[PDB]
Symmetry: C2
Subunit: 203 residues, 2 copies
């Protein structure tokens, strides 16, 4: 019986790539979604008995847990197209610290360097849906995964601010945190191989 | 008159891409090499009067300085091919904390999250040459830029440990830190455009 944690920044297309592989080898595979803000916090509770976390969050090192890289994924800074930063201050880039950010909150109340808010005017939410709902309402700007802003950018509901900072979207590593135990069995290695190929072609 | 800082992790091929561009627009262009460990430390001294830093090091935000991404570059974990971690513990990956690291020292004595050593047994050096000299001598392992370990890996002098952690080498963003002043003049934007194209095709 195996527990796997995917944060809500991992496209749910990926979430199949593993699932088809892991059931070849394992009898029971439990998939658990979490805020990227909650991914590392969670696996650090032993009682949670997580054996794999796919998350964008980075941490020096965790107890009974090895890190590797599965691949890369995109994120944009988005705001309401009428937003002061659309074009008028767009070239400014570092203006973001002065406008209100819609940031993912953490249950733990504290954040990594990566996912810590950058503005002093912050409004915390649990998930990317809440974030973008508020961002469409012109309440603030936010950083969301590509799969969450695809539709809205085509619709013109949302506008990108990040293109000058990082053309093509903000490249973000996807880490695999894995219980040290798995490091030997060919099963885990099959999963990595597939998972890597299967997220390579999603670019 | 314009001062530009390239850390020693930026391939010196790149270091031309800019230089050909910047002299179209500027009359005097001063190129300054620094340890990636010293790049941000340096520009934070106003008396240094740096107007651009190309560095792999990341920092939340700097005074009178905006950040953007020029592109990506490779880094490998290397050790002497006889090294205990070649193959015998290679799959271990997190063993690195237990073997001696050859880390870039900083003049400032302190390091970013990114460039901070990961082993407790550290041996600091000024530059990647010293690092690899010691790594060939089997004294410890180290993380070096691709351009520095190309030859030695073909020669078999050095071996990669990083391939399971991150197939293809460790992707590392190259940031451009730029004095806020430049954000308006078309000159800087020409430089970014070129610099981005010119580092894209170096992959
Ligand atoms: C603050 C600024 C410049 C906009 C950046 N911040 C990050 C760090 N960061 C944060 N939140 C994210 C959420 C989802 C995803 Cl998919 C990625 C990120 C991310 O990289 C980078 S670039
Ligand atoms: C500790 C470990 C797992 C091996 C990693 N550390 C980094 C962070 N890091 C550090 N030193 C570097 C030097 C040159 C270059 Cl080109 C890149 C790096 C780098 O990414 C990543 S992966």
């Amino acid at each position: 019986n195996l527990r796997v944690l995917l944060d809500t920044a991992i496209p749910p297309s990926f979430c199949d790539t593993v699932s088809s592989v892991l059931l070849d080898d394992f009898n029971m595979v439990s998939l658990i979604r979490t805020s990227p803000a909650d991914s590392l916090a969670t696996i650090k509770q032993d009682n949670a008995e997580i054996d794999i976390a796919i998350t964008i969050d980075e941490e020096l090192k965790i107890s009974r847990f090895n890190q590797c890289v599965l691949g890369y994924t995109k994120a944009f800074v988005v705001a309401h197209p009428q937003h002061p930063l659309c074009n008028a201050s767009l070239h400014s880039i570092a203006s973001l610290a002065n406008y209100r950010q819609i940031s993912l909150g953490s249950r733990s109340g504290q954040h990594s360097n990566l996912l810590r808010p950058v503005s002093d005017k912050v409004l915390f939410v649990e998930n990317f849906d809440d974030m973008l709902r508020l961002v469409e309402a012109g309440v603030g700007w936010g950083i969301a995964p590509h799969y969450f802003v695809e539709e809205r950018l085509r619709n013109g509901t949302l506008a990108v601010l990040s293109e000058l900072y990082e053309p093509g979207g903000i490249d973000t590593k996807v880490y695999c945190y894995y219980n040290t135990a798995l490091e030997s069995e060919r099963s885990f290695l099959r999963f990595l191989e597939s998972a890597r190929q299967r997220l390579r072609e999603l670019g």
